[PDB]
Symmetry: C5
Subunit: 331 residues, 5 copies
C-alpha cells in the first residue's frame, strides 16, 4: 500500500512475525556471534576498529531502526527506504556511508508464483549493517565461512565483507534461473506435445513472472555497475577487482533473463500454430466423411421415392473411390 506523510518511518512490508538481531564482529584473528533481541546491546560496535556485521532481522519494528539510524548518523529519508520494501534496488553514496538496497527471491515451484524480500545494506567504517524483513536467508554460507575461518574473509577488511554478502545474494539468482530454465523446459513440451487447457494460462504466468523478474535484475545490475565506477571506501586493488566478478555475475543474470523473456515471448505463437494445425486435421476429417457420405446418402435418397440392386451399390462404391483417390492430393 501507500503513505501520505512527509518522510516518516512506516513499514510497508507484510512480515510481522520475527525479530532477531544477530552480530558478527571479527578481526584478522577472532570473532563472536550472538542473537540478542535487545536494541542497545549492538550500538557500542560503531567504534570497534574491527569488521562488524550488525544484521537486524525483522524490520517491522520501526522503533529499532529509528534508534540504530539516529545513532549511526543515518539520514532520516534513507531509513524510510529500508522500511519501504516496494522500491527499485539502488545504491546511494554518501559522505560517511554507502547505502544499498537489494531484493532476493523465492520461486514456489508447482504453484507458479514468486515472492520477494527486500534486504538493505549500509556500509560504514567497519560495519556492514543489514536489514531483513523475515528470518532465513542465503547468507548462511558467508557467516559459516567466517565461522570456520574458510577462505580470505577474516584476513581482509570490513568493506570486503559487503562484497561477500552481495556475492551470496546475487549467487541466489543463479538458483532462480536454474528453476526457470527447468521450468520453461517442461512448460515448452506442454506446447509441442500436450495442447491442453491451462497450458496457456501457465505460459502467461511465466511472462508475467519474467517481467516481474527482469525489472529487479536490470536495476540490481546497475547497482553493481554504479558500485564499480566510483566507490569511496574501496581499498582499490583488493575489493574492487573482486566485485568486478560479482558485477560480472549481475550481468549474466540479466542476460540469461533476457534469453528467457525472448523464448517465452514467442511461445504462445508456437501454440497458436500447433492448434491451427489441429483445427486443420479435425476440419479435414469432417470434410471427407461428408463428401463420401453426403453424396451417397443422396443417391440412397432418391431411391426412397414413392411415385439391379448391385447397380446402385456398384455406382455408389465407385464414387466412394473416385473420392478416396481425389483425396490423395490432401493426404
Amino acid at each position: 500500500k501507500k503513505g501520505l506523510p512527509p518522510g516518516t518511518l512506516v513499514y510497508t512490508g507484510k512480515y510481522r512475525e520475527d525479530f532477531e538481531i544477530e552480530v558478527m564482529n571479527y578481526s584478522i584473528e577472532e570473532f563472536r556471534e550472538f542473537k540478542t533481541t535487545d536494541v542497545e546491546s549492538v550500538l557500542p560496535f560503531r567504534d570497534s576498529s574491527t569488521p562488524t556485521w550488525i544484521n537486524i532481522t525483522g524490520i517491522h519494528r520501526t522503533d529499532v531502526v529509528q534508534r540504530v539510524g539516529e545513532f549511526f548518523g543515518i539520514h532520516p529519508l534513507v531509513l524510510e527506504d529500508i522500511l519501504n520494501v516496494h522500491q527499485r534496488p539502488k545504491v546511494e553514496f554518501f559522505e560517511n556511508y554507502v547505502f544499498i538496497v537489494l531484493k532476493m527471491f523465492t520461486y514456489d515451484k508447482n504453484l507458479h508464483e514468486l515472492e520477494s524480500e527486500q534486504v538493505s545494506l549500509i556500509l560504514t567504517k567497519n560495519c556492514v549493517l543489514m536489514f531483513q524483513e523475515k528470518i532465513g536467508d542465503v547468507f548462511d554460507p558467508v557467516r559459516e565461512r567466517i565461522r570456520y575461518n574458510r577462505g580470505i574473509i577474516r584476513k581482509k577488511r570490513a568493506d570486503y565483507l559487503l562484497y561477500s554478502l552481495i556475492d551470496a545474494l546475487v549467487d541466489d539468482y543463479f538458483v532462480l534461473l536454474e528453476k526457470i530454465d527447468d521450468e520453461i523446459d517442461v512448460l515448452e513440451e506442454e506446447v509441442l506435445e500436450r495442447p491442453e487447457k491451462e497450458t496457456v494460462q501457465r505460459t502467461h504466468q511465466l511472462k508475467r513472472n519474467l517481467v516481474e523478474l527482469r525489472k529487479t535484475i536490470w536495476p540490481l545490475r546497475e547497482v553493481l555497475s554504479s558500485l564499480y565506477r566510483d566507490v569511496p571506501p574501496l581499498i582499490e586493488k583488493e575489493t574492487v577487482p573482486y566485485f568486478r566478478d560479482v558485477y560480472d555475475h549481475t550481468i549474466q543474470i540479466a542476460d540469461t533473463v533476457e534469453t528467457f523473456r525472448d523464448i517465452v515471448s514467442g511461445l504462445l505463437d508456437v501454440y497458436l500454430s500447433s492448434v491451427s494445425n489441429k483445427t486443420n486435421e479435425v476440419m479435414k476429417v469432417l470434410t471427407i466423411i461428408a463428401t463420401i457420405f453426403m453424396p451417397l446418402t443422396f443417391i440412397a435418397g432418391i431411391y426412397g421415392m414413392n411415385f439391379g440392386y448391385p447397380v446402385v451399390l456398384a455406382v455408389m462404391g465407385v464414387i466412394a473411390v473416385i473420392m478416396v483417390v481425389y483425396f490423395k492430393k490432401k493426404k
Copy 2:
C-alpha cells in the same frame, strides 16, 4: 482544439465552472488561509519574506492570470502554456523563476476511461504560485500538514514547499497504478476464464489508456530528472536530496507503467489462442457426430430402397465402435 495568434492568452481546457483563489502564507512560526475571489488581494505577497502558496483554482479566467503574470514578471509565452492544457509536462528554468507544468489523473473505474487536469507551478523567491483548472486536488494533505504543523514543512523554506506539492502530485500516480494493477488482474481473468464478447474491446481500451498514461509519465519523469541536474534556488543539501526521493518515485512509476504496457501488450495473444482452442473443441465435436451419424444414416439410407433386422443394427452398432475407438487418438 487549436489556436492561430502569435502568443496571446487563450485557455484551451474545458472546465469553465469554478474560480477560487486560495493562499497559504507561512513562516517558521505561523500561517493563515483564505478563499478570496478578488484578484488584487494576493499581489502584495510577492515581497513577503515568508513562504507563500498562491493557489489560483480555475484558470479559465484568462484575465486573472494575465494580471498576476504581469505583476510577478512572468514571460508572456510561459503564461500561455499555463492556459494551454494540451501540452507535455516540462520544466522551464529562468533568470528569476522556475516554471513547471504537471498533469494529474482521474481513472473512472468501471467506465474504463481516464481524465486529465493540468497543474502549473511557478517558483519565485518565497512564492510557489499554482494554477489548477478545476476545484479539488491531491494537495489536501500538504495544506493540512502546514495547517496542524506536521513534519518539517514550516521549519523549511519556500523552494522546499514546491517539493511537497510535487511529492503530493506524483504520489497520486501510485493510486492510478493500484487501480490499474487491480484492473489488469480482473481483465486478465476475463481472457483465461470468460472468453465472451466485449472482453476484446475492454482490452484495447487498456492499451489505449496505457499509451495515454505512458506518454505523460515518461515526460513527468524527465521533469524530475531535469529538476535534479541543475537548479538555481535549491539550498543544496536540504531540498536536493529530498526530491531525489521523488525523482526516485517518478522512475518507479514509469517503470511500473512499462510493466503494464508489456503484460497487456501480449494479452490479446492469450485470447486468440484461448479462442482458437475453443474453436478446436467445437470443431471436433462436429467432426465426430458426423462420422458416426453420417456413415450410419448412409446404411439406413440404402435400406430405404424401393426396387435379419439385428444384422444391420449389429453392423451399425459395431461401426459406431470402430469409430469411438479410433477416436481415442483424439481424446
Copy 3:
C-alpha cells in the same frame, strides 16, 4: 523520379501551374505588399536594412531560382535541394545564410491519403527568402499579423521573422494530428463494432500513412533541435527562447505520432481476435444444429427400412433435451 547530372538545377516536383512572387518588406514602422511575376523587381531587397520576406511561389521555374540564387550568393547545390522536393527536411548552416527545408501536409479526409508540398527557407541578413511549389499555404495568419500590426512581429528583427513562418508551418501539423486522432477514433470503432470487409485495408492505409508521416516529423524535429544548439544570427535572449517553444511543439508532434503508430500498430490484432470470436459463434451454431438434427434424422432413418408412434417421437424429443441440457456448458 530521379536525376543523373553532376549538381544542376532540375525540379522533381509535379506542380507546374502557378507562379507568383510575393514580397513583404517591413520596418518597426511600416510595410508594403505586392504580387509581381517579374524576377528582377525583388533583387534590390538584398541590401534593404529592414526585414524583407521574398516569397517565391511556384518553384517549377528553374530559371527564376537560378537568378535569385546567383545574386544572393547561394551555393549551387543548396539551390538544387530547393528544387528537389523528394528530400528529408534539414537545416544547413553556412558562413552567410541559414538554409532550412521543410514539408507541410494535406490530409484528404475520406479519401484516406496525404499529400506533401516542400517549402524551403533561406535566412540571410534581413531577408527570409521562401520557396513554395504551389499557391496557398498556412502562412496566411503570419502575413496578416504583419498586415494589421498584431503582436510583436514588426517590433522585432528579420531572423525572428523566420521563427514565425516556422511556428506557422509546425502549427499546421497539430491540425493533421487532430484529423488523425478523429480518424483513428472512428476507424477503431470499425474494428470493435463493424467487422466488415475494407476495414482491414483502411487500417493498413493508416499504418502506411503514419509511417509516411513519422518519417517527416522525426527529421523536422531534428531541424528545430539543430536550430537550437548552434545559430549564428540568433539575437540570443530574444529569438532563441522563442523557438524553444516551437522545438517544444516539434517534440509533441513526433510524440503524438508515436502514440498513433502504437495504437494502430496493435489494431489489426484486435480485429483478428474479434473475427476469430465470430468464427466461434458461427462454428458453434453449426455444431449444435447437427448434434440434435443429425442424431434424430438417424433414428428417423432406420424407420424408413423396407425389410407406438409417440414412442419414437418421445425418445427423439428426449434426446433433443439430453442435448440442449448438455449444451449448458457451452452457453
Copy 4:
C-alpha cells in the same frame, strides 16, 4: 565459401569470365581512354601529377591485383579484402591511401531476387584505383561526364573524382528503391484483393530481400558518415561540402529502406486477417444451409416412417422463414 590461410590473396567471388583494365587520366585540359589487358601498361600512372582513374574490371585475376598492390604500396591484407567479396562495406584510412569497399545491386524484377557485385576503391594522390568483378556498371555517366567535359569534373582534383564514382554508385540505390516501392505497391494489392497461394511466399521473399538490403545500406551509410568526420586528402571547402550531399543521400536510402521494412513487416498480418475474414463467410454459409436444410430434412425424415400434404410443406416453409429472419442479426 571460406578460407583458412594467414592472409593470402584468394578471390571468393563467382564471376570468372571478364578481364578488362580501363584507365582515364585527365587534367584541367585533356584526357585519354583505353582498354589494355596488360598489367604493366598502367603502373607508370602512379606519379602522373594529374587525376588518373585506373579501373581494373575482373578481380578473379589474383595475380593482377597482387602486382598493382605491391607497386602502389598497398598493405597485404587490404588487398585480400578487395578479393573477398563476402564483406561488409567499410572505409579504411591509411598513412598514404584511403580504402573504400562498396556493394552495388541488381534487382531481377519478376524473379524476386537480388544480386550483389562488390566494388573496391583506393584513393592515393591523383589515382582513384578501382576494382570490379564483372563487366558493366553504373559508372557510365561519370566517365561520359569526363568524356564530353560536362560539369565541374575536369576542373577539380583527383580526390573529387572519388566523390563522383561514389555519387554514381549511391545514386543507383535510388533505382532499387524505386523498383521495390513499385514492388510493394503491387505485392500489397495481392494481399487486399487477391488472397491466393504463393502471395505469402512472395511476401516472405520481400522481408528476406529487405533484410539483405538493409544490412548493406546501414554500413554503406556509415562509410559516408566516417568519410565525413575525418579525411586527410579532402581539400576542405571543396570536396567535403560536396559529399555531405551524398552522405545526405546515404541517409535517405537507409531511411526509405526502414519504411519498407516497416510496411512489409505488418503485411502478413493483413493477410491473416483478410483470410480469417473469408473463413468467416465460408464458415457462415455452411452454418446457414444446415440450419434450414438439416431441420427440414428431419421433418421429412419422420414422415418416411413405416409403422394434409400442404400442412407439412407449410410448416416447413414457415420454419425456413423463422430461420431466414433470425439470420438478419448475422447479415
Copy 5:
C-alpha cells in the same frame, strides 16, 4: 550446476575423459612439439624468450591448473573462470597477462542441437597459455602453419600467436553460420511447401538455438572490440592492424546472426498464414458439398412421404447448377 564457496577451484564442465598437455615453443628459426601428461615438464617455459604455446587439454584436473596458475602468477579468481565453463566470453586485462575466455561450437546437423566447449587464453610475455576441456579443436591449421613454416607466424612474436588462435576460433563460426544458412534454407521450404507436424517444433528449435547462439557472439564481438581499444602488449602497427581484421570478422558474425534471428523470427507467421489458407480450402469444400447435397437430399426427403420422375431430377439437376454457377464468385 552451481558453487557456494568463496573463490576456490571447481570445474563445472562435464568432460572428464581426456588429459593431454601439448606445447609448441618456437623462434624465428625452429620449433618442437610433444604431448607430455606430466605437469612439471612445461613450467620452465615461462622464461623462454621465444614464443611458446602451452596448450593444456582437459581442464577437469583442477590440480594441474592450480599449479600452472600459481607458477605463472595468475590471480586465484581468474583461474576459477577457466574451470567454470558456464560463463560469458570476456577479456580481462592485467598488470602482467591478458586473459581471454572464448567459446567454440559444434552443430549436430539433423539432430537439431548445438554443443559448447569453453577455451581460455592467457597471454604472458612469450607464452600463450591455453585451456581446452576436450580433445580436438579448430586450432589444427594454426599448429600446422607453424609446423611446415607457412606464412608469417614464425617470423613474428608471441602476442601475434594469440591473434592466430583467435582467428582460427572465430573462423569456425563461419562454418556454423554456413550450416544454419543451409538449415534455414531447408526448414523454410518446410513451411511454404510441406505444412506437416513437427515442422513447428523444428522452427522453435531454431529460434532457441539462435538465441543461444546470439548470446555468445554478441559478447565474443565485444572481446575483440575491447581487445582493440586498449592492449598493453600489442606491437602497435604489427599485431593491432592484424586483428582489426578479426574484430571485423567478429562483427560480420553477430551481424549475420542478427539476420537469421530476423528471418526465423517471422517464419512461424508464414506458417500460421499458410495453414489458415489451407483451413480455408478444406472449409470451402465442406461448404460446397453441403449446399448442393443438403438442399437436394431435402427434395428427395419430402418425396419419401407416406401420406413425372424426370420433373424432380430436372429440378434437382438445375439447382445443382444454380449452385455451381453461384460458386464462381468463390472459385
